[PDB]
């Protein structure tokens, strides 16, 4: 029932996923080196965004960005040694 060629993958204990291409991969030796022989979401606000900049500017993000949630980061940082020269 699936048009060929296809690949089908299912978990042996149960949702299948598929590959269907016009041509399956074919190893091309004639193509010159080094060509192949075969030639977002915010973790903080737990939500997918439309535009990165605008999402960072949103009050949802700004609020996380300014919280105490980065304590876990600062905790490791405090253990590191600052060895650069700092200017005013």
């Amino acid at each position: 029932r699936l048009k060929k060629p296809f690949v089908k993958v299912e978990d042996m204990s149960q949702r299948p996923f598929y590959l269907q291409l016009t041509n399956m991969p074919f190893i091309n030796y004639s193509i010159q080196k080094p060509c192949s022989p075969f030639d977002g979401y915010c973790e903080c606000c737990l939500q997918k965004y439309e535009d990165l900049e605008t999402h960072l500017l949103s009050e949802q993000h700004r609020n996380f960005a300014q919280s105490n949630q980065y304590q876990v980061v600062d905790d490791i940082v405090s253990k590191l040694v600052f060895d650069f020269v700092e200017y005013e």
């Binding site: 060629p5 690949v7 590959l19 080094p34 030639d39």
Partner: protein
């Protein structure tokens, strides 16, 4: 240029410390910049600054730093000098290592240099695997190679996960790599993914080095890569191995396993030893349980005597 300006603005303290020269790397989750700084100890020094995408969960940021602090700075694994934070913007400061593009050196390395590269990659992998770190994004752009100095650094713990008994605490509280370097058990979404997935990746790197082709598996999605893998390692072989990890694979077109020596020679130094292709075969084992480990790889006959 505008990126450099925006970085300074995001982390103002950076302008007190660094002269940021150029952007040297970029991925889904970070940008890496070349910068100059003055050491208190006296020398001026080139620094790599890694600006993590401000959508990273703090635990993800912290786990990457913890990999660098605990496992890094040793055995060809990149370490960390310092880390700068203003709010959601974190910038990791690391030593700069001048390094080749993989495409450039690929077809110009001697065979001895191929074996030195692989040996040094396995040293880095053995080190991280000792801590129970699964890198999950091992590929040439994450393995810095200074040809002239014979220096190596495995980089980028931003996609790492822990083994069940990981020594990196934060990894227990844990993003997809490049399809072309992902193991069959990864491409088929096996819930259990071990350090073996990085050994697969190192085999894909070794496959590029032996065939002179990069990217070897050119694929923008997981199943296309799996289909390409089947044409190299064989559909029946892949289907049999996948059963052992609880995945049923159906393929309409049966394709034979390729002989690795003949494959690499036709794609591509006059007397590559059988040991090289034997090691490749173990790295590209379709069964992750039987796939060679980094420790075992270092003891493989391919590397006598180094």
């Amino acid at each position: 240029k505008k990126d450099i300006e925006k970085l300074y603005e995001a982390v103002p303290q950076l302008s007190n410390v660094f002269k940021i020269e150029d952007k040297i790397g970029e991925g889904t989750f970070s940008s890496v910049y070349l910068a100059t700084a003055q050491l208190q100890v006296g020398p001026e020094e080139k620094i790599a600054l890694k600006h993590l995408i401000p959508t990273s969960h703090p635990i993800r940021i912290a786990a990457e730093l913890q990999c660098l602090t605990v496992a890094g700075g040793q055995d060809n694994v990149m370490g960390v000098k310092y880390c700068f934070r203003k709010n959601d913007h974190v910038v990791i400061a690391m030593p700069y290592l001048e390094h080749e593009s993989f495409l450039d050196i690929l077809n110009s390395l001697s065979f001895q240099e191929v074996r030195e590269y692989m040996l040094n990659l396995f040293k880095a992998l053995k080190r991280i695997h000792q801590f129970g770190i699964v890198h999950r994004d091992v590929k040439p752009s994450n393995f810095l190679y200074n040809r002239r100095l014979k220096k190596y650094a495995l980089v980028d713990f931003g996609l790492a996960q822990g083994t069940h008994d990981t020594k990196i605490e934060l990894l227990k509280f844990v993003r997809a790599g490049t399809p072309g370097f992902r193991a069959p058990e990864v491409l088929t979404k096996c819930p259990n993914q071990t350090t073996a997935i990085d050994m697969w990746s190192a085999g894909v790197i070794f496959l590029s080095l032996l065939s002179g082709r990069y990217p070897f598996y050119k694929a923008s999605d997981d199943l296309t890569a799996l289909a390409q893998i089947m044409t190299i390692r064989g559909s029946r072989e892949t289907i049999q191995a996948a059963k052992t990890f609880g995945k049923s694979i159906l393929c309409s077109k049966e394709v034979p396993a390729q002989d690795l020596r003949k494959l690499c020679e036709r794609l591509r130094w006059n007397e590559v030893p059988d040991e090289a292709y034997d090691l490749l075969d173990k790295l590209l084992d379709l069964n992750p349980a039987s796939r060679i480990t980094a420790e075992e790889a270092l003891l493989h006959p391919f590397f006598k005597d180094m």
